[PDB]
Amino acid sequence: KKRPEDFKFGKILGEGSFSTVVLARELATSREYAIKILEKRHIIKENKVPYVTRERDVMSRLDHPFFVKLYFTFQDDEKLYFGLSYAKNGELLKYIRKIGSFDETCTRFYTAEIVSALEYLHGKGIIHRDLKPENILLNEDMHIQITDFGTAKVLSANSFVGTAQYVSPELLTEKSACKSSDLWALGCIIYQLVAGLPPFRAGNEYLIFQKIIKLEYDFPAAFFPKARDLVEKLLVLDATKRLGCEEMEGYGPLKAHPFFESVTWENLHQQTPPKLT
Numbered sequence: 401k402k403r404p405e406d407f408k409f410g411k412i413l414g415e416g417s418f419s420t421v422v423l424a425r426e427l428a429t430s431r432e433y434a435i436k437i438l439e440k441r442h443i444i445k446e447n448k449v450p451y452v453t454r455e456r457d458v459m460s461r462l463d464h465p466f467f468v469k470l471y472f473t474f475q476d477d478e479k480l481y482f483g484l485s486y487a488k489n490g491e492l493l494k495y496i497r498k499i500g501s502f503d504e505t506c507t508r509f510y511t512a513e514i515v516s517a518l519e520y521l522h523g524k525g526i527i528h529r530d531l532k533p534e535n536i537l538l539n540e541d542m543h544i545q546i547t548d549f550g551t552a553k554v555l556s557a558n559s560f561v562g563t564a565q566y567v568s569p570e571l572l573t574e575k576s577a578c579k580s581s582d583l584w585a586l587g588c589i590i591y592q593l594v595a596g597l598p599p600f601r602a603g604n605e606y607l608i609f610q611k612i613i614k615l616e617y618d619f620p621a622a623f624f625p626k627a628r629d630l631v632e633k634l635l636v637l638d639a640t641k642r643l644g645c646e647e648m649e650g651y652g653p654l655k656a657h658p659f660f661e662s663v664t665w666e667n668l669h670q671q672t673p674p675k676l677t
């Protein structure tokens with residue numbers, strides 16, 4: 401049974417959807433956690449506060465090596481506290497910024513872990529809706545840990561959530577999001593690992609939505625050819641035609657794409673990740 405003073409609170413790690421996430425070390429153990437802090441004053445009708453407003457949440461307990469996990473809960477007079485996994489190596493976006501772009505072996509390995517993670521998440525009937533490199537964290541061992549910041553939803557129009565660069569055309573034009581929306585976001589992320597920047601770029605968010613809906617993007621000359629082929633099979637306007645979706649026979653043909661030829665799917669979490677250089 402813990403409380404605020406078993407901990408030293410340190411740097412802010414993230415924010416959003418009514419809460420702050422703070423690095424904290426447990427004094428007895430020296431162990432480090434990311435503590436989501438939520439002010440009780442925020443818990444009202446006009447607000448959708450994540451994880452608290454939900455009758456049923458099966459996300460709270462999500463427990464898989466490629467996702468952030470919940471370790472403990474406690475409260476004080478004004479706030480609630482949720483002890484989450486701390487991903488010591490920060491955001492994948494930070495490595496894309498540091499090294500400019502990833503080589504093919506690193507793109508293949510990290511893309512396969514995101515695919516693996518998605519397969520699991522979608523098999524649990526959950527969709528993320530805001531998948532992007534800022535939400536793909538790296539633990540101390542350099543494996544991914546995906547985080548939700550309030551957009552993930554159990555499948556039982558849809559809320560206008562997400563980040564403009566990664567949002568699907570079906571969310572924009574049909575108000576709908578499905579498993580296949582996170583597969584569109586996976587195509588933007590693969591592009592961004594290879595090219596160094598995401599594929600839909602424009603002067604403002606409205607202009608970026610216009611490029612998404614028209615499929616206006618291009619590949620640099622050096623983009624790895626099998627990766628270009630995979631991205632072309634994910635960035636398809638018709639959501640029922642993306643590789644990986646149920647109507648395309650599911651995750652088997654996505655994992656069987658030539659870009660993943662030397663991948664061993666079964667044990668990615670037990671493989672030593674390639675050095676990022």
Ligand SMILES: O=C(N[C@@H](COc1ccc2[nH]c(=O)[nH]c2c1)c1ccccc1)c1cccn(Cc2ccc(F)c(F)c2)c1=O
Nearest residue numbers: 413414417434450459460468485486487547548549550552
């Ligand atoms: O509470 C969970 N996530 C937090 C964010 O947690 C963070 C944020 C940054 C950090 N940096 C770091 O090192 N550790 C950090 C932890 C949240 C905040 C605000 C609203 C909603 C959620 C949270 C609680 C339980 C499980 N998961 C993982 C998850 C659930 C559903 C999904 F679809 C999914 F893809 C993943 C959480 O993200």
